[PDB]
């Protein structure tokens, strides 16, 4: 009940950090190569 909520919060953070990081790699790829 409370473990579950705690676990959902860690998983959200992981998705925010890994997808977030991946898009930053694209943006950075974009700034180097061009604009």
């Amino acid at each position: 009940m409370w473990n579950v909520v705690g676990q959902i919060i860690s998983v959200l953070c992981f998705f925010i950090l890994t997808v977030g990081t991946l898009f930053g790699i694209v943006y950075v790829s974009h700034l180097l190569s061009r604009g």
């Binding site: 925010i16 930053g24 700034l31």
Partner: protein
């Protein structure tokens, strides 16, 4: 040449990072805030 939008995303990912670290290394090396100790 970064945007504000991007800086702000970068701050938000810096927060998750440090929040995570604090939880991992604070109870272990101080013996307090015992809910996150492992």
């Amino acid at each position: 040449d970064i945007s504000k939008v991007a800086w702000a995303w970068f701050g938000v990912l810096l927060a998750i990072c440090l929040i995570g670290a604090f939880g991992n290394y604070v109870p272990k090396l101080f013996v307090k805030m015992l809910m996150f100790l492992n």
